[PDB]
Design a protein around this motif. Structure first.
Motif, PDB file in Angstrom:
ATOM      1  N   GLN A  26       0.975  -1.165  -0.032  1.00  0.00           N
ATOM      2  CA  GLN A  26      -0.102   0.064  -0.007  1.00  0.00           C
ATOM      3  C   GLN A  26       0.957   1.076   0.087  1.00  0.00           C
ATOM      4  OE1 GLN A  26      -3.139  -0.738  -0.401  1.00  0.00           O
ATOM      5  NE2 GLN A  26      -3.679  -2.572   1.255  1.00  0.00           N
ATOM      6  N   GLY A  27       2.165   1.135   0.344  1.00  0.00           N
ATOM      7  CA  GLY A  27       2.918   2.446   0.262  1.00  0.00           C
ATOM      8  C   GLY A  27       3.031   2.880  -1.200  1.00  0.00           C
ATOM      9  N   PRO A  28       3.618   4.159  -1.380  1.00  0.00           N
ATOM     10  CA  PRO A  28       3.794   4.460  -2.851  1.00  0.00           C
ATOM     11  C   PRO A  28       4.728   3.805  -3.706  1.00  0.00           C
ATOM     12  CG  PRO A  28       4.757   6.197  -0.959  1.00  0.00           C
ATOM     13  CD  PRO A  28       4.031   5.048  -0.309  1.00  0.00           C
ATOM     14  N   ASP A  30       7.840   3.109  -5.672  1.00  0.00           N
ATOM     15  CA  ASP A  30       9.128   3.749  -5.794  1.00  0.00           C
ATOM     16  C   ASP A  30      10.091   3.097  -6.611  1.00  0.00           C
ATOM     17  OD1 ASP A  30      11.419   5.888  -4.522  1.00  0.00           O
ATOM     18  OD2 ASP A  30       9.486   6.453  -3.806  1.00  0.00           O
ATOM     19  N   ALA A 101       5.930  -0.158  -0.189  1.00  0.00           N
ATOM     20  CA  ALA A 101       5.920  -0.702   1.158  1.00  0.00           C
ATOM     21  C   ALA A 101       4.425  -1.556   1.593  1.00  0.00           C
ATOM     22  CB  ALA A 101       6.253   0.354   2.111  1.00  0.00           C
TER      23      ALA A 101
END
Lengths: 209, 209
Positions: A26-28, A30, A101
């Motif tokens: 769910q993290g951005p 990258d 992440a």
């Protein structure tokens, strides 16, 4: 796993780096590519980023204008890059680091850039005299391994001396106890999977004096 | 720059990693710490992340529960971590990677963990006989360098044999042509900046037979 990629000078390298997202990630998104060149001892240098849904590619001046994400929809699962107009100086280790992440994944590529044989010199190393030992050498200035050589006789019989038949596919012919009959024009043709080069020498075996 | 940090076993390491943001740095703040342990050949392993304003710290089981961001407001400019209850196994290279696109910065730390001397054995290597050569050895089981040694005589004159005065601060005393007068109880005290250990031996120099 360090996947080898091999291309010729001037061609474009495709460094694939497709990824699946876990619904937990769910993290951005990258993405970072880094280079560690052979030519020097700098290591882990950023060449391009995908961060905050934007591309940042002004990092490594030797690669200026030549590194691009392959895909037009990177966020769908494609972190692959193109490296265009390959130079010998681009040889190195390329790392793709993908993060969303908690998920993190890396992959390395070992890039080699091939060049055809060129600047090939054909020459005799030694005195060209009856009874002498000397050397026929075919020396490319450039040329990626693996290299194939092939000597031929262009003049007169158009036939290589029998004693030399074993070194006919070798860059060096080690002539022993030279006969005047060995004289002639000889061609050395050198190739690898990129391309070819050829040179020529004249052998004139004369009395020693 | 690879900044050395040295702490004792059980203490907490502070790995500072403060950063300034350029007003140009508009991408999302992304922070990654990685470890490359000495004890093995895994390299660049994520131990903790700050991504999307959230901490992810379930990565490296040997460090479970022991790695935390130092600051309660990481986004204000502090990527420092604490590593608590240091184990000998935590010795390694720690890397802080800070990104806020286009800005990227890294820094490495070389972590060493010290232990006091312990398990120290005092013993004679050789036959304890008049005329003999033998060795007095003080051997710690554990103990971080640099180590200091000091022999003393506990018994009788409480004075070290004159010939041994040069090896009094050495872990090994190389006894030559042993006198019966060398006999006695001797103490070896070993220390480093963490702590101390001590052992004892009895030397009984008898006729060879």
């Amino acid at each position: 796993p360090e996947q080898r990629i091999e291309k010729a000078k001037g061609e474009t390298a495709y460094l694939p780096c497709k990824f699946t997202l876990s619904p937990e990630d769910q993290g951005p998104l990258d993405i970072e590519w880094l280079i560690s060149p052979s030519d020097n001892q700098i290591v882990d240098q950023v060449i391009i980023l995908y961060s905050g849904d934007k591309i940042y590619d002004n990092y490594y001046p030797d690669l200026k204008g030549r590194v691009h994400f392959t895909s037009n929809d990177v966020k769908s699962g494609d972190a692959s890059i193109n490296v265009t107009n390959l130079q010998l100086s681009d040889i190195g280790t390329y790392q793709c680091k993908v993060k969303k992440a908690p998920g993190v994944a890396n992959k390395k590529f070992l890039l080699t850039v091939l060049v055809k044989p060129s600047g090939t010199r054909c020459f005799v190393d030694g005195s060209e005299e009856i009874g002498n030992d000397f050397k026929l050498k075919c020396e490319p200035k450039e040329g990626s391994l693996p290299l194939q050589f092939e000597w031929q006789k262009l003049s007169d019989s158009q036939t290589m001396p029998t004693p030399w038949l074993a070194e006919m596919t070798s860059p060096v012919i080690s002539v022993k106890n030279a006969s005047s009959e060995y004289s002639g024009t000889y061609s050395c043709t050198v190739q690898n999977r990129v391309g070819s080069d050829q040179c020529m020498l004249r052998l004139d075996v004369v009395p020693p004096s």
